[PDB]
Amino acid sequence: DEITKKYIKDNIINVDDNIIKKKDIFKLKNENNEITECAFEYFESKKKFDDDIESRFFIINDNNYNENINLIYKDIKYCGLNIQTTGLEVFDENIRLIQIAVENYPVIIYDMFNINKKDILDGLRKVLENKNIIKIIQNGKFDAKFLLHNNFKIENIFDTYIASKLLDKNKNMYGFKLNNIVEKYLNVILDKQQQNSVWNNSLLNNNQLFYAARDSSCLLKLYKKLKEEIKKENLHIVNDIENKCILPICDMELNGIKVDLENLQKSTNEILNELNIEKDNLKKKLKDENINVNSQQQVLKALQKNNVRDISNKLIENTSDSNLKNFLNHEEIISLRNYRRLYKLYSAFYLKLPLHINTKTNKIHTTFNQLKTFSGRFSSEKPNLQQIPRQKNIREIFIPNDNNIFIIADFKQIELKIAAEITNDEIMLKAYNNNIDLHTLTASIITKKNIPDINKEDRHIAKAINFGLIYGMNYVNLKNYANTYYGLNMSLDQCLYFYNSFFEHYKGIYKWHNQVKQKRALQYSTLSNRKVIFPYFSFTKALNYPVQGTCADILKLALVDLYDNLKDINGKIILCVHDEIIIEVNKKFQEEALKILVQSMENSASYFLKKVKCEVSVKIAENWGSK
DNA sequence: GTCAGTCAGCTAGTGCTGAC
DNA sequence: GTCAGCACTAGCTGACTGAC
Numbered sequence: 210d211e212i213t214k215k216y217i218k219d220n221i222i223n224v225d226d227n228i229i230k231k232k233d234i235f236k237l238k239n240e241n242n243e244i245t246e247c248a249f250e251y252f253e254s255k256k257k258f259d260d261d262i263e264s265r266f267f268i269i270n271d272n273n274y275n276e277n278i279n280l281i282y283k284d285i286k287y288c289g290l291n292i293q294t295t296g297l298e299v300f301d302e303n304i305r306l307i308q309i310a311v312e313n314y315p316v317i318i319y320d321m322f323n324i325n326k327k328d329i330l331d332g333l334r335k336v337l338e339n340k341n342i343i344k345i346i347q348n349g350k351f352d353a354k355f356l357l358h359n360n361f362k363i364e365n366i367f368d369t370y371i372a373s374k375l376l377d378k379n380k381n382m383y384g385f386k387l388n389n390i391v392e393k394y395l396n397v398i399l400d401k402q403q404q405n406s407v408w409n410n411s412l413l414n415n416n417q418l419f420y421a422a423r424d425s426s427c428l429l430k431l432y433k434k435l436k437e438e439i440k441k442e443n444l445h446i447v448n449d450i451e452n453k454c455i456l457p458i459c460d461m462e463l464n465g466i467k468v469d470l471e472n473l474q475k476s477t478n479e480i481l482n483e484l485n486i487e488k489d490n491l492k493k494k495l496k497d498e499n500i501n502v503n504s505q506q507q508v509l510k511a512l513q514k515n516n517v518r519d520i521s522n523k524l525i526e527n528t529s530d531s532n533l534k535n536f537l538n539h540e541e542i543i544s545l546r547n548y549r550r551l552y553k554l555y556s557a558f559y560l561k562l563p564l565h566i567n568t569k570t571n572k573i574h575t576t577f578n579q580l581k582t583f584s585g586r587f588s589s590e591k592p593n594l595q596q597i598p599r600q601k602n603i604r605e606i607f608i609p610n611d612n613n614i615f616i617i618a619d620f621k622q623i624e625l626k627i628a629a630e631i632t633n634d635e636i637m638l639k640a641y642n643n644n645i646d647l648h649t650l651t652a653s654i655i656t657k658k659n660i661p662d663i664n665k666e667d668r669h670i671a672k673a674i675n676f677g678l679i680y681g682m683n684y685v686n687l688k689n690y691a692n693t694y695y696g697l698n699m700s701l702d703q704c705l706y707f708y709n710s711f712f713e714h715y716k717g718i719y720k721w722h723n724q725v726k727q728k729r730a731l732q733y734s735t736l737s738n739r740k741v742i743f744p745y746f747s748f749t750k751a752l753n754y755p756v757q758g759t760c761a762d763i764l765k766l767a768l769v770d771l772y773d774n775l776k777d778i779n780g781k782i783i784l785c786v787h788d789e790i791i792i793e794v795n796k797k798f799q800e801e802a803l804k805i806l807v808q809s810m811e812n813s814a815s816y817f818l819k820k821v822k823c824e825v826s827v828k829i830a831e832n833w834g835s836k
Numbered sequence: 837g838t839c840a841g842t843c844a845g846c847t848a849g850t851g852c853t854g855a856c
Numbered sequence: 857g858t859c860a861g862c863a864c865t866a867g868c869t870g871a872c873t874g875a876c
Contacts (some may be wrong), residue, residue, distance in 0.1 A: 253858095409872080503860095503861060503862070504861075504862050505852075505854055505861075506841085506853075506862070506863060507863085508854095509837075509853085527854090528853080529853090529854070529855095549854085549855075550855090554856085557856055557859095593856090596856055596858095597856095619867095
């Protein structure tokens with residue numbers, strides 16, 4: 210229809226009219242700092258949107274490109290960047306539209322499908338790469354990933370999702386989408402009724418482009434309000450850290466971690482054979498060939514039929530992991546426990562990994578999220594890295610890329626050091642000034658032995674108790690904590706003596722406990738001023754939030770510094786799980802990489818913590834499970 | 837020849853029970 | 857706290873009797 214193809218030359222298909230091609234004379238400065246009059250083509254909705262946000266937009270395709278459009282970018286301080294894509298996955302999908310929003314101008318839409326003169330994107334490249342231009346993005350991780358994968362470089366960034374998430378102080382989990390944020394702050398409904406319209410088509414209809422335009426112009430108003438809201442809340446440090454840490458997360462997701470297919474196959478074969486053998490052994494032991502082991506009720510019934518009892522001559526009524534410890538005086542239960550371990554390991558890692566492995570590159574790629582965790586630490590999904598077993602044999606599957614070598618660095622006692630810093634415990638700080646671990650010190654006070662005489666087992670008990678009592682556990686739960694996660698049986702009187710001895714000397718932590726318990730505050734702040742406001746008081750989380758948040762801040766600062774300091778030797782930041790950072794570097798630059806990693810981690814530690822001095826243990830690893 | 841009354845397999849949901 | 861895996865209990869949906 211002649212109505213519908215009015216603007217086909219610029220790849221626009223009319224749906225319900227509501228589109229006009231209008232030209233007006235603009236006033237722009239020249240490269241010689243001289244105002245120049247230029248005529249531009251911009252489209253407009255025939256029906257004015259009820260809100261005050263802009264809806265004008267240029268479209269820049271192969272034909273319509275005008276060289277003078279690059280002058281908008283000059284002498285700016287913020288610009289709104291949003292990109293539309295055919296699908297979610299970065300590897301299987303391209304970028305359809307790039308949008309730029311410069312204040313008091315329409316939104317410039319670059320149609321990458323109808324762009325072939327590579328000088329077109331030069332202005333986009335320079336506005337993206339400039340470090341003096343605060344690019345505003347919504348959900349910066351997704352857009353940054355798509356841009357980096359296609360040879361673009363984007364340097365500065367300001368994500369409205371991070372600002373909104375931090376400002377809410379973890380009040381609500383859901384929300385924090387573009388429509389919700391704009392409604393909450395600027396009092397406007399974006400009418401996001403586009404139900405994921407088909408983007409693959411070369412031709413794009415009016416509603417899609419206009420909805421994409423209001424998603425870019427609305428970011429500048431959010432920038433203005435969120436900047437002031439953050440400034441009034443003293444959240445600028447953590448916001449800056451998160452914004453600059455967006456890009457390292459994109460690097461980690463893009464590069465991934467390679468899996469040795471041959472070793473994975475060998476381990477899977479061996480583990481399946483071991484599972485079959487143990488299953489057969491249990492089958493003979495349970496004396497029921499038809500028995501299915503996985504049925505929890507059925508194994509309970511079978512063990513009941515076996516009539517094995519307790520030390521109290523009590524029949525088993527539960528196969529809880531700790532209840533198995535109470536019933537260990539038989540070969541049956543040993544076989545059952547071994548089978549449970551093998552089954553969980555097998556069907557949780559070995560049979561699940563092949564789905565995640567991309568046969569195109571034979572690498573595992575993760576989806577890192579940086580503010581879903583309450584404490585602030587990174588959380589992985591799709592493949593859950595923290596759920597990967599941490600035993601030696603399982604991790605060896607992960608190898609570096611061909612012709613490379615891993616560097617692995619991990620903090621030591623970052624929680625305990627941060628606790629010492631915040632609580633200002635004099636004895637801990639005077640201890641760490643002379644390089645003695647707080648596990649060794651805790652063991653020394655517990656066992657009354659001299660420092661050189663401390664063994665490894667005392668260090669283990671210290672490892673238990675320091676974590677136990679530095680997050681405000683009542684001494685009753687110390688027994689459960691030590692037994693369950695470390696296996697050390699303990700008596701209540703021993704727990705009482707340990708509690709008294711621990712809080713008699715480390716005075717600072719006692720003062721911290723007293724203050725936090727007395728105030729019963731509903732709001733807490735970390736050393737990066739990451740504020741959280743709970744619904745109701747909880748002593749455990751009240752004690753746990755500051756140290757964990759500060760540890761997350763230290764890791765994020767380390768990644769931000771590392772991503773800038775590793776660009777010379779072209780090292781990839783691969784993963785960051787727990788207090789551990791992994792970088793892959795070419796085999797020549799091993800020494801330089803080690804120095805860079807250590808320096809970045811130490812500087813990050815020294816930025817927030819001042820009294821103490823963190824240390825990092827770095828080992829060059831052939832495989833992630835190296836020595 | 838035909839329709840009730842009762843016998844079920846199937847699918848869901850909840851109950852309950854375990855570890856990464 | 858998240859997660860799968862299974863009895864058990866229930867309600868439904870066709871087929872095997874039961875009939876005057």
